[PDB]
Design a protein around this ligand. Structure first.
Ligand SMILES: O=C(O)C1=C[C@H](O)[C@H](O)[C@H](O[C@H]2[C@H](O)[C@H](O)[C@H](O[C@H]3[C@H](O)[C@H](O)[C@@H](O)O[C@@H]3C(=O)O)O[C@@H]2C(=O)O)O1
Ligand SMILES: [Ca+2]
Length: 490
Protein backbone atom coordinates (compact mmCIF):
# COMPACT_ATOMS: atom_id res chain seq x y z
CA UNK A 1 0.00 0.00 0.00
CA UNK A 2 1.07 3.62 -0.67
CA UNK A 3 -0.47 6.86 0.80
CA UNK A 4 -1.05 7.87 -2.79
CA UNK A 5 -3.11 4.81 -3.76
CA UNK A 6 -6.50 5.89 -5.14
CA UNK A 7 -7.97 2.39 -4.76
CA UNK A 8 -7.09 -0.45 -2.35
CA UNK A 9 -7.80 -3.15 -4.96
CA UNK A 10 -5.62 -2.76 -8.03
CA UNK A 11 -7.44 -1.36 -11.07
CA UNK A 12 -6.55 -1.58 -14.75
CA UNK A 13 -8.19 0.76 -17.30
CA UNK A 14 -7.95 0.98 -21.08
CA UNK A 15 -6.77 4.22 -22.71
CA UNK A 16 -6.92 5.24 -26.32
CA UNK A 17 -4.16 7.80 -26.78
CA UNK A 18 -2.55 8.28 -30.20
CA UNK A 19 -0.71 11.61 -30.38
CA UNK A 20 1.53 13.78 -32.54
CA UNK A 21 0.97 11.42 -35.47
CA UNK A 22 3.84 9.29 -34.07
CA UNK A 23 3.17 7.89 -30.55
CA UNK A 24 0.76 5.85 -28.43
CA UNK A 25 0.29 5.32 -24.67
CA UNK A 26 2.85 2.71 -23.57
CA UNK A 27 2.18 0.90 -20.31
CA UNK A 28 5.89 -0.05 -20.26
CA UNK A 29 6.99 3.56 -20.13
CA UNK A 30 9.01 4.32 -16.95
CA UNK A 31 6.65 7.19 -16.08
CA UNK A 32 3.54 5.06 -16.56
CA UNK A 33 4.98 2.28 -14.39
CA UNK A 34 5.83 4.81 -11.66
CA UNK A 35 2.40 6.38 -11.66
CA UNK A 36 0.76 2.94 -11.60
CA UNK A 37 2.94 1.96 -8.62
CA UNK A 38 2.07 5.12 -6.69
CA UNK A 39 -1.67 5.17 -7.49
CA UNK A 40 -2.58 1.47 -7.85
CA UNK A 41 -4.18 2.25 -11.26
CA UNK A 42 -2.58 0.90 -14.42
CA UNK A 43 -3.48 2.17 -17.89
CA UNK A 44 -3.23 -0.21 -20.85
CA UNK A 45 -3.13 1.31 -24.32
CA UNK A 46 -5.41 0.23 -27.10
CA UNK A 47 -4.49 2.65 -29.94
CA UNK A 48 -2.88 1.55 -33.24
CA UNK A 49 0.83 2.17 -33.00
CA UNK A 50 1.27 1.87 -36.77
CA UNK A 51 -0.99 4.80 -37.73
CA UNK A 52 0.42 8.20 -38.65
CA UNK A 53 -2.64 10.45 -38.19
CA UNK A 54 -3.81 10.91 -34.62
CA UNK A 55 -7.01 12.65 -35.59
CA UNK A 56 -7.99 9.90 -37.93
CA UNK A 57 -7.30 7.37 -35.15
CA UNK A 58 -9.70 9.25 -32.85
CA UNK A 59 -12.27 9.05 -35.59
CA UNK A 60 -11.58 5.32 -36.25
CA UNK A 61 -11.89 4.71 -32.49
CA UNK A 62 -15.22 6.45 -32.27
CA UNK A 63 -16.37 4.28 -35.18
CA UNK A 64 -15.04 0.93 -33.86
CA UNK A 65 -17.70 0.13 -31.28
CA UNK A 66 -17.47 0.34 -27.50
CA UNK A 67 -15.20 3.06 -26.24
CA UNK A 68 -12.27 2.38 -23.89
CA UNK A 69 -12.15 3.99 -20.43
CA UNK A 70 -10.01 7.05 -21.16
CA UNK A 71 -9.21 8.90 -24.38
CA UNK A 72 -6.27 11.29 -24.60
CA UNK A 73 -4.15 13.18 -27.08
CA UNK A 74 -3.30 16.45 -28.85
CA UNK A 75 -5.77 18.64 -30.68
CA UNK A 76 -8.79 16.89 -29.18
CA UNK A 77 -10.53 19.78 -27.36
CA UNK A 78 -13.20 20.18 -29.97
CA UNK A 79 -13.82 16.45 -30.21
CA UNK A 80 -14.04 16.18 -26.41
CA UNK A 81 -16.62 19.05 -26.31
CA UNK A 82 -18.61 17.86 -29.32
CA UNK A 83 -18.78 14.26 -28.16
CA UNK A 84 -19.12 15.24 -24.48
CA UNK A 85 -22.21 17.32 -25.29
CA UNK A 86 -23.63 14.20 -26.96
CA UNK A 87 -22.87 11.95 -24.01
CA UNK A 88 -19.77 9.92 -25.05
CA UNK A 89 -17.58 11.72 -22.51
CA UNK A 90 -18.89 12.51 -19.02
CA UNK A 91 -18.88 15.91 -17.30
CA UNK A 92 -16.14 16.11 -14.70
CA UNK A 93 -17.40 19.11 -12.66
CA UNK A 94 -18.87 17.24 -9.73
CA UNK A 95 -16.23 14.49 -9.77
CA UNK A 96 -13.61 17.21 -9.46
CA UNK A 97 -15.44 18.96 -6.66
CA UNK A 98 -15.85 15.82 -4.66
CA UNK A 99 -12.73 13.91 -5.35
CA UNK A 100 -9.90 15.92 -6.95
CA UNK A 101 -8.54 18.42 -4.44
CA UNK A 102 -5.43 19.34 -6.50
CA UNK A 103 -7.47 20.19 -9.56
CA UNK A 104 -10.14 21.94 -7.50
CA UNK A 105 -7.44 24.20 -6.12
CA UNK A 106 -5.75 24.62 -9.51
CA UNK A 107 -9.00 25.72 -11.20
CA UNK A 108 -9.67 28.18 -8.39
CA UNK A 109 -6.37 29.88 -9.05
CA UNK A 110 -6.59 29.50 -12.80
CA UNK A 111 -10.13 30.58 -13.67
CA UNK A 112 -8.97 31.37 -17.22
CA UNK A 113 -7.95 27.75 -17.64
CA UNK A 114 -11.29 26.46 -16.37
CA UNK A 115 -13.09 28.88 -18.70
CA UNK A 116 -11.04 27.70 -21.69
CA UNK A 117 -11.95 24.04 -21.16
CA UNK A 118 -15.65 24.42 -20.26
CA UNK A 119 -18.32 23.70 -22.89
CA UNK A 120 -21.37 25.79 -23.82
CA UNK A 121 -23.49 23.53 -21.59
CA UNK A 122 -21.32 24.54 -18.60
CA UNK A 123 -19.61 21.10 -18.39
CA UNK A 124 -15.95 20.19 -18.29
CA UNK A 125 -15.39 17.23 -20.56
CA UNK A 126 -11.58 16.94 -20.40
CA UNK A 127 -8.51 17.97 -18.41
CA UNK A 128 -5.93 19.86 -20.43
CA UNK A 129 -2.25 19.96 -21.05
CA UNK A 130 -1.27 23.14 -19.24
CA UNK A 131 2.00 24.51 -20.66
CA UNK A 132 4.32 26.66 -18.57
CA UNK A 133 6.35 29.54 -19.99
CA UNK A 134 5.78 32.65 -22.14
CA UNK A 135 7.48 32.59 -25.55
CA UNK A 136 7.61 29.49 -27.72
CA UNK A 137 9.10 29.93 -31.17
CA UNK A 138 11.51 32.36 -32.80
CA UNK A 139 13.54 32.75 -36.00
CA UNK A 140 16.97 31.12 -36.17
CA UNK A 141 19.60 31.62 -38.86
CA UNK A 142 23.06 30.21 -39.60
CA UNK A 143 25.48 32.94 -38.41
CA UNK A 144 28.40 30.92 -39.70
CA UNK A 145 26.89 30.98 -43.20
CA UNK A 146 26.24 34.72 -42.93
CA UNK A 147 29.88 35.19 -42.01
CA UNK A 148 31.17 32.85 -44.77
CA UNK A 149 29.24 34.91 -47.31
CA UNK A 150 30.02 38.29 -45.72
CA UNK A 151 26.29 38.97 -45.22
CA UNK A 152 24.70 41.05 -42.49
CA UNK A 153 21.78 39.80 -40.41
CA UNK A 154 18.73 40.54 -42.57
CA UNK A 155 16.47 43.23 -41.16
CA UNK A 156 13.70 43.27 -43.74
CA UNK A 157 11.99 40.72 -45.95
CA UNK A 158 13.86 42.02 -49.01
CA UNK A 159 17.22 41.62 -47.21
CA UNK A 160 16.12 38.12 -46.11
CA UNK A 161 15.34 37.16 -49.76
CA UNK A 162 18.82 38.15 -50.79
CA UNK A 163 20.36 36.15 -47.90
CA UNK A 164 18.33 32.99 -48.55
CA UNK A 165 19.10 33.17 -52.28
CA UNK A 166 22.82 33.42 -51.36
CA UNK A 167 22.50 30.43 -49.06
CA UNK A 168 21.01 28.51 -52.01
CA UNK A 169 23.47 29.66 -54.62
CA UNK A 170 26.81 30.48 -53.08
CA UNK A 171 27.75 27.09 -51.50
CA UNK A 172 28.14 28.22 -47.88
CA UNK A 173 28.87 24.67 -46.73
CA UNK A 174 31.90 24.74 -49.08
CA UNK A 175 31.41 21.31 -50.65
CA UNK A 176 31.06 22.48 -54.25
CA UNK A 177 27.49 21.34 -54.53
CA UNK A 178 24.23 23.23 -54.62
CA UNK A 179 22.77 21.18 -51.82
CA UNK A 180 21.77 23.88 -49.32
CA UNK A 181 18.12 24.38 -48.34
CA UNK A 182 17.74 27.93 -47.04
CA UNK A 183 14.55 27.58 -44.91
CA UNK A 184 13.58 24.31 -43.18
CA UNK A 185 10.93 23.45 -40.64
CA UNK A 186 9.71 20.52 -38.57
CA UNK A 187 6.15 21.82 -38.96
CA UNK A 188 4.44 22.04 -42.35
CA UNK A 189 2.19 24.74 -40.94
CA UNK A 190 5.17 27.06 -40.50
CA UNK A 191 5.27 27.41 -44.28
CA UNK A 192 1.86 29.12 -43.97
CA UNK A 193 3.23 31.36 -41.21
CA UNK A 194 5.70 32.78 -43.73
CA UNK A 195 2.81 34.95 -44.97
CA UNK A 196 3.61 37.09 -41.88
CA UNK A 197 6.49 38.47 -43.93
CA UNK A 198 3.87 40.00 -46.26
CA UNK A 199 1.61 41.41 -43.50
CA UNK A 200 -0.89 38.52 -43.33
CA UNK A 201 -1.71 36.33 -40.30
CA UNK A 202 -1.68 32.54 -40.42
CA UNK A 203 -3.20 31.81 -36.93
CA UNK A 204 -4.34 33.68 -33.82
CA UNK A 205 -2.63 31.41 -31.27
CA UNK A 206 -0.43 28.33 -30.79
CA UNK A 207 -3.40 26.30 -32.02
CA UNK A 208 -2.88 25.96 -35.76
CA UNK A 209 -5.33 27.84 -38.03
CA UNK A 210 -6.99 29.62 -35.15
CA UNK A 211 -9.09 32.77 -35.46
CA UNK A 212 -7.83 36.20 -34.45
CA UNK A 213 -9.39 39.53 -33.53
CA UNK A 214 -8.67 42.86 -35.19
CA UNK A 215 -10.40 46.03 -33.96
CA UNK A 216 -13.23 44.14 -32.37
CA UNK A 217 -13.80 41.82 -35.33
CA UNK A 218 -13.24 38.06 -35.48
CA UNK A 219 -11.22 37.04 -38.59
CA UNK A 220 -9.89 33.74 -39.89
CA UNK A 221 -6.40 34.08 -41.45
CA UNK A 222 -7.09 31.75 -44.40
CA UNK A 223 -10.16 33.74 -45.53
CA UNK A 224 -8.45 37.15 -45.73
CA UNK A 225 -7.34 38.85 -48.98
CA UNK A 226 -3.98 39.47 -47.27
CA UNK A 227 -3.57 35.69 -47.18
CA UNK A 228 -4.20 35.38 -50.93
CA UNK A 229 -1.55 37.96 -51.66
CA UNK A 230 0.84 36.65 -49.02
CA UNK A 231 0.60 32.99 -50.06
CA UNK A 232 1.54 34.07 -53.60
CA UNK A 233 4.82 35.29 -52.22
CA UNK A 234 5.37 32.13 -50.22
CA UNK A 235 4.67 30.09 -53.39
CA UNK A 236 7.32 32.16 -55.19
CA UNK A 237 9.96 31.46 -52.54
CA UNK A 238 8.91 27.79 -52.72
CA UNK A 239 9.27 27.86 -56.54
CA UNK A 240 12.74 29.32 -56.31
CA UNK A 241 13.84 26.67 -53.80
CA UNK A 242 14.32 29.06 -50.83
CA UNK A 243 11.83 26.92 -48.84
CA UNK A 244 12.47 23.22 -48.35
CA UNK A 245 10.78 21.35 -51.24
CA UNK A 246 9.85 18.69 -48.71
CA UNK A 247 8.32 21.08 -46.15
CA UNK A 248 4.92 19.27 -46.21
CA UNK A 249 6.53 15.83 -45.86
CA UNK A 250 9.85 15.89 -44.01
CA UNK A 251 8.40 16.82 -40.59
CA UNK A 252 9.70 15.68 -37.20
CA UNK A 253 13.39 15.13 -37.87
CA UNK A 254 13.87 18.03 -40.26
CA UNK A 255 16.47 19.66 -37.99
CA UNK A 256 18.48 16.47 -37.39
CA UNK A 257 18.58 15.88 -41.17
CA UNK A 258 19.22 19.33 -42.48
CA UNK A 259 21.36 20.89 -39.82
CA UNK A 260 23.13 17.49 -39.18
CA UNK A 261 24.06 17.34 -42.89
CA UNK A 262 24.97 21.09 -43.00
CA UNK A 263 22.31 21.92 -45.60
CA UNK A 264 19.74 23.95 -43.62
CA UNK A 265 20.10 27.74 -43.29
CA UNK A 266 17.19 29.00 -41.22
CA UNK A 267 14.07 27.91 -39.34
CA UNK A 268 11.30 29.15 -37.07
CA UNK A 269 10.96 26.87 -34.05
CA UNK A 270 11.11 26.60 -30.24
CA UNK A 271 14.08 28.29 -28.67
CA UNK A 272 15.37 25.55 -26.35
CA UNK A 273 15.45 22.53 -28.63
CA UNK A 274 16.49 24.52 -31.70
CA UNK A 275 19.44 26.15 -29.97
CA UNK A 276 20.55 22.72 -28.63
CA UNK A 277 21.66 21.81 -32.16
CA UNK A 278 24.67 24.11 -31.68
CA UNK A 279 25.81 21.83 -28.89
CA UNK A 280 24.81 18.53 -30.50
CA UNK A 281 26.56 19.30 -33.80
CA UNK A 282 29.70 20.96 -32.41
CA UNK A 283 31.86 17.84 -32.79
CA UNK A 284 30.82 17.07 -36.36
CA UNK A 285 30.46 20.66 -37.66
CA UNK A 286 32.90 22.76 -35.58
CA UNK A 287 31.83 26.13 -36.81
CA UNK A 288 28.09 25.45 -36.79
CA UNK A 289 26.38 28.51 -35.30
CA UNK A 290 22.56 28.74 -35.37
CA UNK A 291 21.42 31.91 -33.63
CA UNK A 292 18.18 33.66 -32.83
CA UNK A 293 17.20 36.49 -35.14
CA UNK A 294 14.64 39.22 -34.62
CA UNK A 295 11.67 38.81 -37.00
CA UNK A 296 12.44 40.81 -40.20
CA UNK A 297 10.45 44.05 -40.75
CA UNK A 298 7.51 42.85 -42.80
CA UNK A 299 5.50 44.57 -45.58
CA UNK A 300 3.39 46.31 -42.89
CA UNK A 301 6.55 47.77 -41.33
CA UNK A 302 6.51 45.58 -38.21
CA UNK A 303 8.51 42.69 -36.73
CA UNK A 304 5.94 40.00 -35.95
CA UNK A 305 6.34 36.89 -33.78
CA UNK A 306 2.93 35.27 -34.29
CA UNK A 307 3.41 32.40 -31.87
CA UNK A 308 3.44 32.09 -28.10
CA UNK A 309 2.79 29.43 -25.43
CA UNK A 310 -0.92 28.78 -25.04
CA UNK A 311 -2.19 28.11 -21.54
CA UNK A 312 -4.03 25.71 -21.74
CA UNK A 313 -3.56 23.81 -25.01
CA UNK A 314 -6.45 22.05 -26.84
CA UNK A 315 -4.81 18.75 -25.72
CA UNK A 316 -5.52 16.36 -22.82
CA UNK A 317 -7.74 13.46 -21.75
CA UNK A 318 -11.34 12.58 -20.92
CA UNK A 319 -13.45 9.95 -19.18
CA UNK A 320 -15.85 8.02 -21.38
CA UNK A 321 -19.41 7.09 -20.47
CA UNK A 322 -18.36 3.43 -20.50
CA UNK A 323 -15.70 3.85 -17.77
CA UNK A 324 -17.09 1.91 -14.77
CA UNK A 325 -14.69 3.59 -12.35
CA UNK A 326 -15.07 7.32 -12.87
CA UNK A 327 -14.19 8.15 -9.25
CA UNK A 328 -10.93 6.15 -9.28
CA UNK A 329 -10.25 7.72 -12.68
CA UNK A 330 -10.68 11.31 -11.52
CA UNK A 331 -8.45 10.52 -8.51
CA UNK A 332 -5.77 9.21 -10.85
CA UNK A 333 -6.09 12.32 -12.95
CA UNK A 334 -5.82 14.48 -9.80
CA UNK A 335 -2.54 12.79 -8.85
CA UNK A 336 -0.92 14.52 -11.80
CA UNK A 337 -1.75 17.96 -10.38
CA UNK A 338 -0.12 17.27 -6.98
CA UNK A 339 3.58 17.91 -6.35
CA UNK A 340 4.82 14.38 -6.98
CA UNK A 341 2.60 13.75 -9.97
CA UNK A 342 3.67 16.99 -11.51
CA UNK A 343 7.34 16.11 -10.98
CA UNK A 344 7.04 12.74 -12.71
CA UNK A 345 4.94 14.00 -15.63
CA UNK A 346 7.59 16.61 -16.35
CA UNK A 347 10.97 15.10 -15.44
CA UNK A 348 10.54 11.36 -15.78
CA UNK A 349 11.59 9.00 -12.95
CA UNK A 350 13.76 9.79 -9.94
CA UNK A 351 17.00 7.81 -10.01
CA UNK A 352 16.59 7.31 -13.75
CA UNK A 353 16.46 10.68 -15.50
CA UNK A 354 16.77 13.08 -12.54
CA UNK A 355 17.65 13.17 -8.89
CA UNK A 356 16.29 15.26 -6.05
CA UNK A 357 19.17 17.51 -4.96
CA UNK A 358 18.62 20.12 -2.25
CA UNK A 359 14.92 19.27 -2.63
CA UNK A 360 14.77 20.06 -6.34
CA UNK A 361 14.56 17.79 -9.40
CA UNK A 362 17.86 17.98 -11.23
CA UNK A 363 18.34 16.22 -14.55
CA UNK A 364 21.33 13.90 -14.81
CA UNK A 365 24.25 14.99 -16.98
CA UNK A 366 23.63 12.05 -19.26
CA UNK A 367 20.21 13.62 -20.06
CA UNK A 368 21.45 17.20 -20.39
CA UNK A 369 24.43 16.27 -22.59
CA UNK A 370 22.63 13.81 -24.89
CA UNK A 371 22.35 14.56 -28.61
CA UNK A 372 18.55 14.40 -28.45
CA UNK A 373 16.68 17.37 -27.01
CA UNK A 374 15.43 16.72 -23.45
CA UNK A 375 11.75 17.00 -24.46
CA UNK A 376 12.29 14.22 -27.05
CA UNK A 377 13.94 12.17 -24.29
CA UNK A 378 10.93 12.76 -22.06
CA UNK A 379 8.45 11.62 -24.72
CA UNK A 380 10.31 8.34 -25.02
CA UNK A 381 9.62 7.48 -21.36
CA UNK A 382 6.14 8.97 -21.12
CA UNK A 383 6.85 12.46 -19.78
CA UNK A 384 5.94 15.77 -21.49
CA UNK A 385 3.05 13.97 -23.21
CA UNK A 386 -0.31 15.66 -23.91
CA UNK A 387 -2.34 14.08 -21.14
CA UNK A 388 -4.04 16.33 -18.52
CA UNK A 389 -0.93 17.60 -16.74
CA UNK A 390 0.72 20.84 -15.55
CA UNK A 391 4.03 21.53 -17.24
CA UNK A 392 6.79 22.96 -15.05
CA UNK A 393 9.09 25.41 -16.85
CA UNK A 394 11.91 24.47 -14.43
CA UNK A 395 12.18 21.22 -16.47
CA UNK A 396 12.92 23.34 -19.54
CA UNK A 397 15.20 25.94 -17.95
CA UNK A 398 17.71 23.16 -17.22
CA UNK A 399 18.33 22.48 -20.93
CA UNK A 400 17.86 26.06 -22.21
CA UNK A 401 21.38 27.02 -23.23
CA UNK A 402 22.79 30.55 -23.29
CA UNK A 403 22.06 30.98 -27.03
CA UNK A 404 18.43 30.06 -26.38
CA UNK A 405 18.19 32.22 -23.28
CA UNK A 406 19.54 35.27 -25.02
CA UNK A 407 16.94 34.69 -27.86
CA UNK A 408 14.04 34.30 -25.41
CA UNK A 409 15.20 37.42 -23.55
CA UNK A 410 15.39 39.39 -26.82
CA UNK A 411 11.88 38.40 -27.86
CA UNK A 412 10.38 39.13 -24.40
CA UNK A 413 12.20 42.47 -24.08
CA UNK A 414 11.37 43.69 -27.55
CA UNK A 415 7.71 42.54 -27.41
CA UNK A 416 7.65 40.87 -30.84
CA UNK A 417 4.88 38.51 -29.74
CA UNK A 418 1.47 39.48 -31.11
CA UNK A 419 -1.52 39.45 -28.73
CA UNK A 420 -2.90 35.92 -28.78
CA UNK A 421 -6.53 34.94 -29.32
CA UNK A 422 -8.16 33.76 -26.14
CA UNK A 423 -11.36 32.38 -27.55
CA UNK A 424 -15.06 33.11 -27.22
CA UNK A 425 -17.96 31.78 -25.17
CA UNK A 426 -20.45 30.22 -27.58
CA UNK A 427 -24.02 29.28 -26.77
CA UNK A 428 -25.17 25.67 -27.29
CA UNK A 429 -26.81 26.61 -30.61
CA UNK A 430 -23.83 28.56 -31.76
CA UNK A 431 -21.69 25.55 -30.86
CA UNK A 432 -23.84 23.29 -33.07
CA UNK A 433 -22.91 25.42 -36.10
CA UNK A 434 -19.27 25.44 -35.14
CA UNK A 435 -19.18 21.66 -34.75
CA UNK A 436 -21.20 21.04 -37.94
CA UNK A 437 -18.93 22.98 -40.29
CA UNK A 438 -15.65 24.17 -38.78
CA UNK A 439 -13.56 20.94 -38.68
CA UNK A 440 -14.25 20.29 -42.35
CA UNK A 441 -13.65 23.89 -43.41
CA UNK A 442 -10.25 23.82 -41.61
CA UNK A 443 -9.31 20.63 -43.52
CA UNK A 444 -10.24 22.27 -46.83
CA UNK A 445 -8.31 25.42 -45.96
CA UNK A 446 -5.18 23.39 -45.31
CA UNK A 447 -5.56 21.48 -48.60
CA UNK A 448 -5.96 24.73 -50.57
CA UNK A 449 -3.02 26.26 -48.72
CA UNK A 450 -0.75 23.34 -49.61
CA UNK A 451 -1.91 23.55 -53.25
CA UNK A 452 -1.12 27.26 -53.33
CA UNK A 453 2.35 26.85 -51.84
CA UNK A 454 3.33 23.98 -54.15
CA UNK A 455 1.89 25.78 -57.17
CA UNK A 456 -0.60 23.07 -58.14
CA UNK A 457 -3.33 25.73 -57.73
CA UNK A 458 -2.75 29.41 -58.53
CA UNK A 459 -4.05 31.48 -55.62
CA UNK A 460 -5.14 34.43 -57.80
CA UNK A 461 -7.04 32.31 -60.26
CA UNK A 462 -8.72 29.96 -57.71
CA UNK A 463 -9.55 32.57 -55.07
CA UNK A 464 -13.09 33.12 -56.23
CA UNK A 465 -13.95 29.42 -56.36
CA UNK A 466 -12.30 29.12 -52.94
CA UNK A 467 -14.44 31.87 -51.42
CA UNK A 468 -17.60 30.29 -52.89
CA UNK A 469 -16.54 26.96 -51.34
CA UNK A 470 -15.97 28.65 -47.94
CA UNK A 471 -19.54 29.93 -48.12
CA UNK A 472 -20.87 26.58 -49.34
CA UNK A 473 -19.02 24.66 -46.61
CA UNK A 474 -20.49 26.82 -43.82
CA UNK A 475 -17.48 29.02 -43.09
CA UNK A 476 -19.39 32.32 -42.94
CA UNK A 477 -22.01 30.65 -40.78
CA UNK A 478 -19.25 29.88 -38.28
CA UNK A 479 -17.76 33.38 -38.60
CA UNK A 480 -21.00 34.91 -37.70
CA UNK A 481 -21.57 32.78 -34.55
CA UNK A 482 -18.05 33.59 -33.54
CA UNK A 483 -18.70 37.31 -33.92
CA UNK A 484 -22.02 37.04 -32.09
CA UNK A 485 -20.25 35.33 -29.19
CA UNK A 486 -17.50 37.94 -29.19
CA UNK A 487 -19.98 40.79 -29.11
CA UNK A 488 -22.19 39.25 -26.46
CA UNK A 489 -19.14 38.80 -24.37
CA UNK A 490 -17.29 41.99 -25.05
O1 LIG B 1 11.27 22.19 -28.36
C1 LIG B 1 11.24 22.93 -27.36
O2 LIG B 1 12.18 23.68 -27.02
C2 LIG B 1 10.04 22.90 -26.59
C3 LIG B 1 9.92 23.24 -25.22
C4 LIG B 1 8.63 22.97 -24.49
O3 LIG B 1 8.89 22.55 -23.13
C5 LIG B 1 7.75 21.93 -25.15
O4 LIG B 1 8.41 20.66 -24.97
C6 LIG B 1 7.66 22.28 -26.63
O5 LIG B 1 7.10 21.14 -27.23
C7 LIG B 1 6.46 21.36 -28.50
C8 LIG B 1 7.25 20.69 -29.61
O6 LIG B 1 8.46 21.37 -29.83
C9 LIG B 1 6.45 20.64 -30.91
O7 LIG B 1 6.20 21.94 -31.43
C10 LIG B 1 5.11 19.97 -30.60
O8 LIG B 1 4.32 19.97 -31.69
C11 LIG B 1 3.26 18.98 -31.57
C12 LIG B 1 1.93 19.79 -31.57
O9 LIG B 1 1.82 20.45 -30.31
C13 LIG B 1 0.77 18.80 -31.64
O10 LIG B 1 0.89 17.96 -30.49
C14 LIG B 1 0.90 17.96 -32.91
O11 LIG B 1 0.68 18.68 -34.05
O12 LIG B 1 2.19 17.35 -32.98
C15 LIG B 1 3.34 18.21 -32.92
C16 LIG B 1 4.56 17.29 -32.93
O13 LIG B 1 5.14 17.03 -31.86
O14 LIG B 1 4.66 16.50 -33.91
O15 LIG B 1 4.40 20.73 -29.63
C17 LIG B 1 5.08 20.65 -28.37
C18 LIG B 1 4.31 21.32 -27.25
O16 LIG B 1 4.49 20.86 -26.08
O17 LIG B 1 3.38 22.12 -27.61
O18 LIG B 1 8.99 22.27 -27.28
CA1 LIG C 1 27.08 23.16 -50.90
Amino acid sequence: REATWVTEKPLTLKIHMHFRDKWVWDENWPVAREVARLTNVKLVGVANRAATNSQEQFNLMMASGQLPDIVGGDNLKDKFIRYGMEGAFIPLNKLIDQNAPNLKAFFKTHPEVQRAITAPDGNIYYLPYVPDGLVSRGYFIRQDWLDKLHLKTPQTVDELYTVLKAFKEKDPNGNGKADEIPFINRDPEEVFRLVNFWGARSTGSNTWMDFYVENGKIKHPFAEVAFKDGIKHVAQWYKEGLIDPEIFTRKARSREQTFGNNIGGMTHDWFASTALFNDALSKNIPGFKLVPMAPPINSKGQRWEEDARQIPRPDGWAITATNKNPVETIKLFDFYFGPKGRELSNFGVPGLTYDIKNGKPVYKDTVLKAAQPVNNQMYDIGAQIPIGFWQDYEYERQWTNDVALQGIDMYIKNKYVLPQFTGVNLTVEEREIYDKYWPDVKTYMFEMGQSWVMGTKDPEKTWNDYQQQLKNRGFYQVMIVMQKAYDRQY
